[PDB]
Design a protein around this ligand. Structure first.
Ligand SMILES: *[C@H](O)c1c(CO)cnc(C)c1O
Ligand SMILES: *[C@H](O)c1c(CO)cnc(C)c1O
Lengths: 269, 264
């Protein structure tokens, strides 16, 4: 039947591994109609790879929103938002829409502000179907600071959930363990640990995971299935990522469908 | 082997049917690594679908090109360029890269809705173009023939545009004829006729570009891109009362449509 319409409110990653590029790519891979409202443009210097974030004026941000909103998204994802104004508006449009799914990837960092954090806490967490911080973002969102363990991650998730998020996944990434990738998923009742092997290039892993979750929810998976299916999606992308230069390599967003499925072990902790 | 890297220099079609959205989606469908240097942001009024083109500052345009060029595209496509200076830089970045394929979709109009720009395309892009993909209006402008009303006028247009330096020319007729010309032979490309065609041209040029990057001859790339876009068109859907985009994934997901090829 008709493609589900999935909007991302996000920034452009010129390198095309992350940000709106990941979102659109992943939305397409998962057979949904992808759309974007750009908040910012990120570029990288040719010699050093230093990032430059160029914000987009609010008037064009709002023009993009009006269009994308008239089209009627079934699910919304947010990525790099950049300002409290934008953060606040991202929240407002979700509520104003007929969308049933709101996936918040609380971007703070790229590979290669309590201000925005508080605005994220205030305006986004209470409407979030799923929120997907990495280890660093989870400690900020929870106000616990540096999380060192599965049990600290459990603490962070309860705190974030109690601030309004219906479902929380914290990516433990290379910080928690480096032989295995652990994420902690929490739904208010039970803590699930999600585990896959590690092999290697993971630029855009985060966005891709949040983008896949949104598509999976748009297409009818429960948040649990959606998160688990997204972890598998991104694990394959990560395994088959490629070297772009001396600083970075993107995930291969098409790997799950074109190369292989990777097993995600799920356990209660 | 590694994913081929394909750059599009284009604008954002907020409706996500055409422009860079169509490009990236098409690029992804054809197993290539798609990238974009954004030239502008196109938005549409909710009530009238009036297009508003917000250009991006030239400084951010150039920072995006610097990053895309360091990554090293295997192929470059152009879409909406908007100014004669954007037109010139697009050609220059093609020449500066090690890219072997330059596909120019000389966009002048959008589904739903400067001859100085037309002159700029003729001077800067056409001499570098592996493939140029005008619709009927754009071909009449690039050729200077004005409104093309027949396969004879299209043949003339294609000859003129080839003579301006484009190596392969396809004029989309808009039954369902496209005219392909390589300098030696005129091939009429046809399928059955199917109105949710928003982004068909971008998708066609984007698929052409990916096919070329993945090793198909220009003839085969065009024929393959036509089948690709025909499926997308056939499976387009109604977005609102003004427009309906093509289904970029329809070739892979839904069905494969045969292209009839005939010399003319
Ligand atoms: C950074 O690379 C990045 C992210 C996080 O990976 C999200 N969005 C944009 C535009 C980025 O550049
Ligand atoms: C128009 O919708 C359009 C075209 C031509 O189809 C190309 N690029 C952009 C950004 C557009 O909006």
């Amino acid at each position: 039947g008709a493609l589900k319409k999935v909007l991302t409110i996000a920034g452009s990653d010129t390198s095309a591994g992350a940000g709106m590029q990941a979102d659109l790519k992943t939305f397409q891979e998962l057979d949904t109609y992808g759309m974007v409202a750009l908040t910012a443009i990120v570029t990288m210097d040719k010699d050093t790879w230093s990032h430059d974030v160029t914000p987009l004026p609010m008037d064009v941000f709002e023009k993009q929103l009006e269009t994308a909103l008239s089209i009627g998204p079934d699910a919304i994802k947010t990525g790099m938002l950049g300002t409290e104004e934008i953060i606040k508006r991202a929240g407002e449009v979700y509520e104003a829409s007929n969308a049933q799914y709101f996936v918040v990837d609380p971007v703070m960092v790229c590979k290669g502000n309590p201000g925005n954090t508080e605005a994220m806490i205030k305006y986004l967490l209470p409407k979030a179907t799923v929120v997907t911080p990495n280890l660093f973002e989870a400690g900020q969102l929870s106000g616990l600071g540096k999380l060192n363990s599965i049990e600290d991650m459990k603490k962070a998730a309860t705190i974030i959930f109690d601030k309004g998020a219906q479902h929380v996944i914290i990516k433990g990434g290379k910080a928690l363990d480096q032989d295995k990738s652990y994420d902690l998923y929490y739904d208010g009742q039970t803590f699930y640990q999600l585990t896959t092997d590690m092999f290697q290039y993971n630029h855009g892993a985060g966005c891709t995971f949040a983008a896949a979750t949104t598509a999976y929810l748009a297409n009818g998976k429960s948040p649990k299935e959606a998160v688990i299916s997204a972890k598998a999606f991104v694990a394959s992308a990560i395994k088959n990522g490629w070297k772009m230069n001396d600083f970075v390599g993107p995930v291969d967003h098409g790997a799950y469908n074109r190369i292989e499925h990777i097993d995600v072990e799920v356990t209660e902790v």
